[PDB]
């Protein structure tokens, strides 16, 4: 009742996924998502065996082999996931609130960058992303 198995995301299919949910997305089968009471568009919380966590958005896939959560490769690096492992998926009953101050630490150091339009690229491509300390 919560332990599923990871797989890669079905390719193509980019004309049936709304544009606001592009970079924050997992895919699930309809009977699996009906079983563990997850709704469409609501966030879910993912916990691995190492105790690393992530908050993403569910989409009805209508296809993925029943019992298979689909994640991208950045998610698999961020939680720490090889394809063929176990993961814990839960729905969120609490509250999500608007952030106002986010201390980010740049990794490495490329050309020091125009800061304000780097902030414009951050706030344009990442919108509605639920943040945790330690995520990339």
């Amino acid at each position: 009742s919560g332990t599923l198995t990871v797989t890669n995301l079905l390719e193509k299919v980019d004309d049936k996924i709304p544009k606001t949910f592009q970079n924050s997305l997992i895919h699930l089968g309809l009977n699996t998502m009906k079983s563990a009471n997850i709704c469409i568009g609501r966030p879910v919380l993912l916990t691995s065996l190492n105790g690393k966590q992530e908050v993403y958005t569910a989409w009805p896939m209508a296809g993925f082999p029943g019992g298979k959560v689909g994640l991208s490769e950045m998610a698999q690096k961020n939680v720490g996931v090889r394809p063929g492992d176990a993961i814990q998926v839960q729905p969120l009953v609490g509250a999500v609130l608007q952030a106002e101050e986010m201390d980010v630490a740049l990794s490495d150091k490329d050309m020091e960058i125009n800061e304000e339009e780097l902030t414009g690229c951050i706030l344009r491509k990442l919108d509605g992303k639920i943040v945790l300390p330690g995520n990339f």
């Binding site: 009953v93 609490g94 509250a95 999500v96 609130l97 608007q98």
Partner: protein
């Protein structure tokens, strides 16, 4: 019970929507879109529509003041004040048949009347209230002041697509001495090109229009 105040999202800006939790909607007994009068903490009041939060969590209040008392747009929430629930009321809205508005235009009668009908379409409004146009609105009306109505919007009411819109109107420093001698020398020149509704076109010429002020740096020429 105390509820917090939060700044509004980018989808509630200019929509007249109040975002409440489910326990406050159970205590108010309101449906979706019903009229809620909010008595503000720093004086004044506003009128809003009740819509639920997506999260389902109770203990938070957001509000967008569009129909406001004049000089009561104090809904900025930097200091995070808390509102009590005893200050929100469920207000019945009968439909109206005639309104009376006074428009504040941006810097003919039919375009101003068409822009008033278009702004006030399907909204709850009260008496002595300013309706502010949203940013990016088409047209020329920037604000409306509500003056009167025949089913009497003192406990407020709803404009309908078949109501009538009519236009009435009733809107209810250092002196520096020492330059007195030269202050009126300026007026004996400049008063005559200030009382000119093309009257000097009709009879006369134009006294000069090109004055020059001179003096030492510090006698207060710019303040004159």
């Amino acid at each position: 019970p105390l509820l917090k105040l939060l700044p509004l999202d980018a989808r509630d800006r200019g929509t007249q929507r109040c975002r409440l939790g489910p326990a406050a909607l159970h205590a108010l007994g309101a449906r979706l879109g019903s009229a809620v009068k909010i008595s503000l903490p720093d004086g004044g009041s506003c009128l809003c529509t009740a819509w639920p939060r997506r999260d389902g969590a109770d203990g938070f209040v957001q509000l967008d003041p569009l129909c406001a008392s004049p000089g009561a747009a104090v809904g900025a929430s930097r200091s995070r004040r808390s509102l009590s629930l005893n200050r929100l009321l469920l207000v019945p809205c009968p439909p109206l048949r005639r309104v009376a508005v006074w428009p504040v235009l941006r810097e003919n009668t039919a375009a101003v009347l068409e822009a008033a009908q278009e702004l006030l379409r399907n909204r709850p409004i009260s008496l002595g209230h300013v309706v502010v146009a949203p940013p990016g609105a088409p047209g020329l009306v920037a604000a409306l002041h509500i003056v009167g109505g025949t089913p009497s919007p003192d406990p407020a009411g709803l404009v309908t697509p078949r109501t009538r819109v009519s236009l009435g109107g009733e809107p209810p420093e250092v002196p520096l001495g020492g330059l007195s001698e030269a202050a009126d020398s300026l007026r004996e020149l400049l008063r005559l090109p200030l009382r000119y509704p093309r009257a000097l076109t009709a009879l006369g010429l134009a006294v000069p229009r090109g004055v020059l002020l001179a003096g030492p740096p510090g006698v207060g020429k710019t303040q004159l």
